[PDB]
Amino acid sequence: SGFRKMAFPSGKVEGCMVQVTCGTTTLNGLWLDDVVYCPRHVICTSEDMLNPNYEDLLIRKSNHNFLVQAGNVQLRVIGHSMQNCVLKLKVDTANPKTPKYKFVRIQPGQTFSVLACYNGSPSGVYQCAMRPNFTIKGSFLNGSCGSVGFNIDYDCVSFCYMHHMELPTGVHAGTDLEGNFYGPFVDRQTAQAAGTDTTITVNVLAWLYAAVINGDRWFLNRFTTTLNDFNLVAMKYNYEPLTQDHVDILGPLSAQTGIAVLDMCASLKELLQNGMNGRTILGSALLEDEFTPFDVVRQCSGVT
Amino acid sequence: SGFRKMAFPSGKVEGCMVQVTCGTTTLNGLWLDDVVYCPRHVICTSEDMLNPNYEDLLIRKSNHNFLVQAGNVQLRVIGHSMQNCVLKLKVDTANPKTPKYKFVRIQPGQTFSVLACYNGSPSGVYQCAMRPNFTIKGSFLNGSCGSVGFNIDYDCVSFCYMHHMELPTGVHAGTDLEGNFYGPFVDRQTAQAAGTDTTITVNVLAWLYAAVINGDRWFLNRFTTTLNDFNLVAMKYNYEPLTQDHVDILGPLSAQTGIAVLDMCASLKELLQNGMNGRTILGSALLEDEFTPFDVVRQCSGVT
Ligand SMILES: CC(C)N(C)c1ncnc2c1cnn2C
Ligand SMILES: CC(C)N(C)c1ncnc2c1cnn2C
Ligand SMILES: CC(C)N(C)c1ncnc2c1cnn2C
């Protein structure tokens, strides 16, 4: 029993983190096989970031200008290329700790673990969600760029995020491992404002199922609702619309608990309308939306 | 910017987890040098746990009855002994991945990372605090016993917790790595109820400093207080008394922010008396107490 915001064990990813330095800029790279992946803004000064021409800046860079260090050992860079907003530095040594891996582009509402790193060295691990406005709410200081987000399926690491940018409102933007930003963000120090940070309704419902499984039940009520009625209330509270696809995904939790998805939606509707009245659910005073239904099943079943 | 509930990177600990089986009971062990540490209740049936005589039960166990598996490889048990509530299984192979390590007994209010494991295999990592009633609020299913809690100082792992027990109220009890329970708990399936789960005041204050550093400032007010006045209010709200030692520990955060510790205590006093009025601090609707002052400085400074 108990339900915690849980990250994947980080060891497989710790074995991939390296330091990348270009001139005066140091950040993190991801070493998989004989390629190191890092934000292309490693080539920029803070001055450059106001209006960078990355193709032009990259002409002035040679393989020997990219200093790649794996622990206290230097890697030899034998090639470099820009793909979207990442650089791929080809090194002469395959990472001997390369796990089975995939690159995946996740959807808003999907969760992942972040291994926050500085100078190629892991500092901490935490659990994030891709927000509906394609920001993440991370913990990233100067030097954390190139830190990655991932999921693990048994022994395969699915890398889904690389950290690039903090917006002026202190939320974070980054790319998949093909270098494509999530959402509309760019690697330039400019006016970029995030849209509405809506609540991931299907994840809240999953977490309410987790609450019932773990004995927090006070919010269960005598009501039901319909998707259309629920969505009228969701929309008023800046919740994502619930779809039949979401209902289908919640089916296993519904089955485990015997609480129909639409009955849980009616519980959630009352919590939105009435608030918590000073009560807590799984140690939270707000409705938690960074657990997916898969997360809840995984954690409630003890998957390794 | 941003402030997250962050665990230590788990890799050094992942390299120490093994499976221990005795008869029909499987749980986790910690393999350091040529010793595997596990809960002594591995030797119990669920029936045994009602009123176990561990010395008597252990007489019926030989080295060959303890099955220790490290990944898919069996370890040879060449000795076993009981120390308090843990078994030490001596194996014929030193763990080649043994990190620098220490065993430490932590104080209530100290935080640590837990690597939740099943069948010797890591499932997730999360951040815990030793509660003032010497329980922890973890996420532990059947099979998670022997999962460990730790801190890391650069390259040295300080192991502070091993999971033994869930109480009927769904909170958790365990031991240090010398096998001594935190608090009054015992490894028997009996009436054990936790005392008051008071709030760790010094940690709340640290987190309010983290909030100011990260731009959440709405709760700062025009007031100050004294330790004695603050403590009259703390006591009413089941907060731990704040001591001058706590004030001294908060000095670096006070210096960084320019907010006197007693001024932050007056902010906290108003939050206790007035509530959050539907507002949030660092994405929380309650006052978070599982960050120590050291945690806040570490995360705000990017220590690896
Ligand atoms: C970085 C993105 C484009 N990649 C490759 C992917 N994104 C989403 N689903 C995927 C892949 C690859 N396979 N599958 C099933
Ligand atoms: C209650 C019905 C009529 N409403 C408005 C909606 N229901 C489901 N998905 C929706 C909406 C609006 N946008 N999207 C994507
Ligand atoms: C398991 C407990 C008794 N151990 C050994 C410790 N507990 C607290 N502080 C400690 C140690 C060892 N050194 N230091 C400074």
Ligand SMILES: CC(C)N(C)c1ncnc2c1cnn2C
């Ligand atoms: C305001 C004063 C008189 N009170 C009661 C206290 N102040 C500091 N530490 C305390 C207490 C009570 N217990 N403990 C450990």
